Design goal:
The structure is cut from a larger assembly and holds 2 copies of chain A (about 50 residues).
Chain A lengths: L22 E5 L2 E5 L15
Antiparallel strand pairs in A: 1-2
């Protein structure tokens, strides 16, 4: 959840498995497509599931 | 009497030759591969910046 204003932007954070960020983000009931090339992590191991 | 001139005026790449120990200072040649691990606390989350 976030605050919102008449105009502005939200810098959201996300985690994704697909190398393309091709996913429909829903904001406050609206739906907007987002996509970009995601790269493989620099570190092959992470302490989180 | 016929030694030729020293390397300080003959060493290439502008390196200033120095003694005790014999070593070449400020050499300028090629490139240096560098890797740096940085503590993640030095960065900030994209939403904070």
């Amino acid at each position: 959840t976030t605050h919102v204003t008449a105009t502005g932007s939200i810098t959201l954070h996300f985690s994704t498995s697909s190398p393309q960020a091709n996913f429909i983000v829903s904001l406050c009931g609206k739906k907007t497509t987002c996509n970009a090339e995601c790269k493989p992590p620099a570190d092959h191991i992470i302490g989180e599931p | 009497n016929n030694s030729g001139r020293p390397l300080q005026e003959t060493a290439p790449f502008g390196c200033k030759i120095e003694v005790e120990p014999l070593r070449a200072s400020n050499c300028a040649y090629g490139h240096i591969p560098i890797s740096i691990d940085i503590p993640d606390a030095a960065f900030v989350r994209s939403s904070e910046s």
